[model samples]
Target: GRLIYTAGGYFRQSLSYLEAYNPSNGSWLRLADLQVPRSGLAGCVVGGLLYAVGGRNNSPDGNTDSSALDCYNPMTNQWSPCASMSVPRNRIGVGVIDGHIYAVGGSHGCIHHSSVERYEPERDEWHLVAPMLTRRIGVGVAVLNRLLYAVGGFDGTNRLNSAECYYPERNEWRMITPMNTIRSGAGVCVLHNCIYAAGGYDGQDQLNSVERYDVETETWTFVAPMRHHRSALGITVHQGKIYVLGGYDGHTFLDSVECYDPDSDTWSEVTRMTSGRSGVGVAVTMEPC
Candidate 1:
């Protein structure tokens, strides 16, 4: 289990991985290189650290949007800076239930945000929670039993199937069951208790559909379907299959790479990714915690 992806032009803000060893052995490596060069962030990986949330930084005439908060440490491959986000976001929705790190819907310029933050990586600080009832933009999140599950995204021009389920014990937030299709830069994970979701851009196409959510019959089912049509993709799930990386298929931008084998339901093809990103932020690094 080893995967870490996130990129955003300025020579594509670097940090990539997936080096051989099955999944059809398609290799690619180039890690630790993001000190800032935003795009459309949102990523999570608690305890073993690797955060990166908030994005969009254009310069030349204006465009800032970034409640910056980087932090990557593949044991000193470096990148450490944290606590930003009080407001200012872009296409967000990151999750990690019990050990803090929650973040939620995004968009700070033309409005679209159901604010929510709760990072606390060993007291690096950031706290403000329970917001997200709707007001989204490229969202996707996970954490099942302990709740926190806000799906789909984009609420401005409306590209949402609407979904919400946050229950940080009793901070409450309920209203699940939605997502028949109506996406926005999707890629969600969670293997055993279900909650798969994949691919994105359903505002009029670009989606190799793959959905699943069964926290004991809580609904949604439409598995396997991604050999193409990505949308800012970058999924995770290492040794139990899943893996997806790289994105953009509305026309170009992609360094391929795919995988998802819920015990033979298939969706193969893996190998390709040296650079060619489209809004990343993905993680999976087994053990070494």
Candidate 2:
């Protein structure tokens, strides 16, 4: 649909602004603002509605995290609150599987949490589910072949390279092949049955490295790196290409954007965003006419 929506993040301060991007014309348009300023939020699309989950509310002490759950209806260009999450978290891993949204590991204040929660739209409720093998925050998650995969993150002590997948039928979580690089605040997405883990922070520095996982082979392979090292960036796949948006690279907030072509195994710079951002949430969906 050529439309991508990105919202809420920290620049000089937490933001409630939302922006939509059109790759077809390389343009952006402002959308309805969120109810409150938030950062490190997790987002997903379910049944055509976009949901923004747990994150930190803009508080002076930085002690207040949010359990708030808000859904956006593209058709009406409006937002409505849904059931709040079971845990107040920031930098959570969120993905959709079997029509339900899974909110994975994230930090609740200063402590890293391993608890997992699932939202059932039909009931407008959240249910406790099998927790992740690792207690981590800033993890990346993606769905492939109906299996939800949680990739590398920080477990409060160290940056993790470990990965795992969830089996909803059995309500279980198990470890899987780990990525070659240790990462946290990475971006993960599924395209053509392969899961891609993009740029992130490796504890020591922001990373420009990229990797791909073949679920069938249960293996990971290195791919081309982005032009800029990105941490807490938003990534999504469209038309066989991977788009990496705004993020921080330790030194500064980044407005740079890049795209990776799997066919050619290369990365190229693309149109930059209007503002530098970090901890932004991005989702791709069709424009409602």
Candidate 3:
């Protein structure tokens, strides 16, 4: 079975907290916590293992990078340590392709990052890759058609509408058409051959508007907006729908969840959950039940 997994949040010791969504029963399940207390981490599942990468630790008043990596094995229900990134960053973007995990730009609490790296399980090491042209934090990354795509985020000075794709073979990044509007902390996941980006901050305010990128046409178009405007939401594609988990809705955190159907082009609400879990990293993992 496949379930959506979420981890980490900065405030109130939510860091290291782990949970999963099970569609078979339409419920959430608690899982083993991270060994390292973390916030703003990046995560991806590779070869049936969930990898949690660099994020902030409980230090420097939440501004320090832990630079740690941990792998969670569903079969064992345990998390093990792995080699950390060469550099530390948080609010990062991650994606897996060909069994290798790519960690993209993040920041030092707005220091911003353009540096990128890739981790190989066989070698258990992270290798430096071509850095992005624009420094980004709160970016959204996902792989589609063998190419990794990075979407809108904060670029130190501003929230970006621009996006780019990476070619692993060439070790290069190429900028693509900019989105119609800026989006940082937007929920991103692939659905129906398109990469959907939903709800984020646009510098001035938290956003509810949504958009999608055509992998085939190489274009961007607006999509159905979520009922609640939010930023820092957890995102994943589950059971053919884009499920957006709890996020901050302006001043307060929201425990509500939203599920978007591509065919209907509409967003439906899931029963509200208890934890707010703002800015959590999300992934759909293949787990044996």
Please name the candidate that would achieve the greatest lDDT relative to the true structure.
2
Candidate 1 off by > 4 Å: 1-41, 44-49, 55-66, 76-79, 82-87, 93-106, 109-136, 139-152, 160-180, 188-235, 243-263, 266-282, 286-289
Each candidate's root-mean-square deviation in Å? 17.2, 1.3, 1.8
* By TM-score: ranked, best first: 2, 3, 1
Task: Rank candidates by lDDT, best first.
Answer: 2, 3, 1
Each prediction's whole-model lDDT (CA): 0.75, 0.87, 0.83
Candidate 2 regions with alpha-carbon error over 4 angstroms: none
Candidate 2 yields a Cα-based lDDT of 0.87
Positional deviation of residue 187's Cα in model 1 after best superposition, in angstroms? 2.2
lDDT of 2 at 247: 94
Output the worst ten-in-a-row residue range by lDDT, candidate 1. Answer: 15-24
What's each prediction's clash count? Answer: 1, 0, 0
Residues 1-289, candidate 3: write the lDDT tens digits. Answer: 3887887765554477888777667777788988877777777788888888877776445446767879988888798999988888788888888999999998865578999998999999999899998998889998897899899988888899999999989999999988898999888778878888889999888989999999878888898899999988888887788888777878777777888888899999876655776867777787634
Evaluate model 3: give its lDDT: 0.83
What lDDT does candidate 3 reach at residue 170?
A: 93
Backbone clash pairs for candidate 1 read: 26-271
Per-residue CA lDDT of model 1 for 1-289, tens digit only, reads 4554444532234333312223423444566567766666767777776788886765555677788888877666677778897988876778887788888878989988887888888898888877877887888888877787888888887888778888876887787889789888788878889888887998787898888889788899898798888886777777788878768887777877788889888887777666667666666543222
